[PDB]
């Protein structure tokens, strides 16, 4: 189903496959195995891996 999170801190992309996001952005999982999750930003529409320790669950 839908699994959503909100960013606690800004994160700037630094790899070919990660996703930049700002604090307060809503991000959804495209599963949650490991510590890097393939996500989609509901703000920007962009996608990529995000660090799970920058986000918190958001219904």
User: Could you give the CA distance from residue 51 to residue 1 in angstroms, rounded to a whole number?
Assistant: 20
For 8, the 3-state DSSP assignment is coil
Q: What is the resolution of this structure in A?
A: 0.9
Q: Which residues contact 16 (CB under 8 A, 6 or more apart)?
A: none
For 52, the 3-state DSSP assignment is helix
Q: Where are the domains of the chain?
A: 1-59
User: Could you give the CA distance from residue 37 to residue 51 in angstroms, rounded to a whole number?
Assistant: 7
Q: Which residues contact 1 (CB under 8 A, 6 or more apart)?
A: none
1-59 under CATH 2.30.30.40, yes or no: yes
């Amino acid at each position: 189903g839908v699994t959503t999170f909100v960013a606690l801190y800004d994160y700037e992309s630094r790899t070919e496959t990660d996703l930049s996001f700002k604090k307060g952005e809503r991000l959804q999982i495209v599963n949650t195995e490991g510590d890097w999750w393939l996500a989609h930003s509901l703000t920007t529409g962009q996608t990529g891996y995000i660090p799970s320790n920058y986000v918190a669950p958001s219904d």
